[PDB]
From a paper:
Using the gnotobiotic zebrafish model, we identified a potent immune modulatory protein secreted by Aeromonas, which we named Aeromonas [name] (AimA) because it reduces intestinal inflammation. To understand the molecular mechanism of AimA’s function, we determined the protein crystal structure, which revealed two related calycin-like domains that are structurally similar to the immune modulatory factor found in mammals, lipocalin-2 (LCN2). Our analysis of aimA and aimB deficient Aeromonas revealed that the proteins’ anti-inflammatory activity on the host is inextricable from the fitness advantage it confers to the bacteria.
β-strands dominate each domain with the carboxy terminal (C-term) domain forming a complete β-barrel and the amino terminal (N-term) domain containing a curved β-sheet. Therefore, we performed structural homology searches against each domain separately, which revealed that both domains had similarity to proteins in the calycin superfamily. The C-term domain of AimA has structural homology both to avidins and lipocalins. The SCR1 in the C-term domain of AimA overlaps structurally with the SCR1 of mouse lipocalin-2 (mLCN2) and shares some related amino acids. However, in comparison to the wide enterobactin-binding cleft (calyx) of LCN2, the homologous regions of the N- and C-term domains of AimA are much narrower, are occluded by loops or a helix, and lack the enterobactin-interacting residues of LCN. An in depth analysis of the structural overlay between the N- and C-term domains revealed that seven out of eight β-strands in the barrels align well; however, only seven total residues are in analogous functional positions across the two domains. Residues 180–181 are at the tip of a disordered loop and were not modeled, and residues 293–294 and the C-terminal His-tag beyond it are not visible in the electron density.
Author numbering: 1 to 179, 182 to 292
Write the structure that this text describes.
Amino acid sequence: MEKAANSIAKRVPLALPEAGLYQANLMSRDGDKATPRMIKDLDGLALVYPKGETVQHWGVWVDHQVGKVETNSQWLGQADQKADKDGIYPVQLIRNSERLGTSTALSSVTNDHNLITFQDQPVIDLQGKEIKRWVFDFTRTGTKFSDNSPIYSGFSGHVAVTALTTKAVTTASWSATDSFSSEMVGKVDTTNNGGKLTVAIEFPAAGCTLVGEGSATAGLSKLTMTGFGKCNFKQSAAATPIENLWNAALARAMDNRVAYVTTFTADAKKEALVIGFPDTNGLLITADKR
Ligand SMILES: [Cl-]
């Protein structure tokens, strides 16, 4: 009876997890009524941005490699908060997935289905243990590439999220898993001076450094970015399809652009910086302490 459920879903802004940083796990499911199981090594990040007065954004990013082939995906969600003229609360979902090997593939698909989040869902974690989690249903933005090859082997289109413990941003030096000066993002420098937060992001290809100011906080700290006038964000060939998407958004960005930053610890007790630019074609910067 999904159509009836979606009909009600439309009448209220989309239910999302509390604003913050999440771990995402791509799941497999065997049947429309079977319990989804997380898939090894198909983990990612998800970010729910704070609720706007008009819109709430969120995103999910996943990077996976097999052989010499990378498959990178981002899902970008926009949930309207105010009502539409038909009394509806629009939801928009976009998947961009790129497959980079000897050949190249990009698949981008939007869908405006409303009932795409599920709260307290049973999920078989990586140990075979059933647990409960928010679940995204990204089935309608597709799971295959055009040659009938699946984007991620076993992926059902369902995505579990788990809240990550985030520290506040400290004064430190970071690196977006990079490096010559040809990459999209390079050094990232953060200063936390008694709560006042400044973040400097070098964009080596664009030839500029963006600087953001904000206030330190547990979870997401809101930044206002400047520096865009000094940058050349163009469509490359040196960039991946998704990077060119990020470039297209950054080329239209202007001073006082909003971003959110937080830190957390990954596996080997190694801290990571995450900066997310809402409504910027999925721009997500992750950086290792250095
Ligand atoms: Cl489900």
